[PDB]
Amino acid sequence: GGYLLG
Amino acid sequence: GGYLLG
Amino acid sequence: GGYLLG
Amino acid sequence: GGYLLG
Amino acid sequence: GGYLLG
Amino acid sequence: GGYLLG
Amino acid sequence: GGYLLG
Amino acid sequence: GGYLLG
Amino acid sequence: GGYLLG
Amino acid sequence: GGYLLG
Amino acid sequence: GGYLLG
Amino acid sequence: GGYLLG
Ligand code: NA
Ligand code: NA
Ligand code: NA
Ligand code: NA
Ligand code: NA
Ligand code: NA
């Protein structure tokens, strides 16, 4: 699983 | 920009 | 529970 | 919890 | 769980 | 202003 | 958690 | 510039 | 002015 | 701005 | 994981 | 300005 914000 | 809640 | 993503 | 990114 | 104010 | 994150 | 004022 | 809270 | 960071 | 990666 | 601000 | 890298 993972997450990204930009 | 962004946001995450869990 | 859950999640909120902008 | 969560995150806020500008 | 979480919360955010801005 | 500002922000509060739990 | 955290907070920011400006 | 930017900011991050977690 | 200024800033406060937790 | 920026990025956050889990 | 990681993060970047600019 | 500048940069921050985790
Ligand atoms: Na992850
Ligand atoms: Na957003
Ligand atoms: Na919380
Ligand atoms: Na804090
Ligand atoms: Na910003
Ligand atoms: Na890191």
- Looking at the complex, report in whole angstroms how far the Cα of residue J3 sits from the nearest Cα belonging to chain A: 5
I6/E1 Cα distance (integer angstroms): 20
Number of H helices, E strands in chain I: 0, 1
Experiment type: X-ray
Number of neighbouring beta carbons within 10 Å of residue F5:
22
F6/D1 Cα distance (integer angstroms): 6
The verdict on a CB contact (< 8 Å) between D3 and A6 is no
Nearest CA in chain F to H5: F5
Chain H interface includes J4 (CB < 8 A): yes
Do strands B2-5 and D2-5 pair parallel, antiparallel, or not at all (unpaired)? antiparallel
Angle at Cα A5 formed by Cα H5 and Cα J2, nearest 5°? 70
Nearest CA in chain D to H3: D6
E3/G5 Cα distance (integer angstroms): 17
**What resolution in Å is listed for this PDB structure?**
1.0
Strand order in the sheet with K2-5: A4-5, J2-5, K2-5, L4-5
C4/I1 Cα distance (integer angstroms): 33
Cβ atoms of G3 and F3 closer than 8 Å: yes
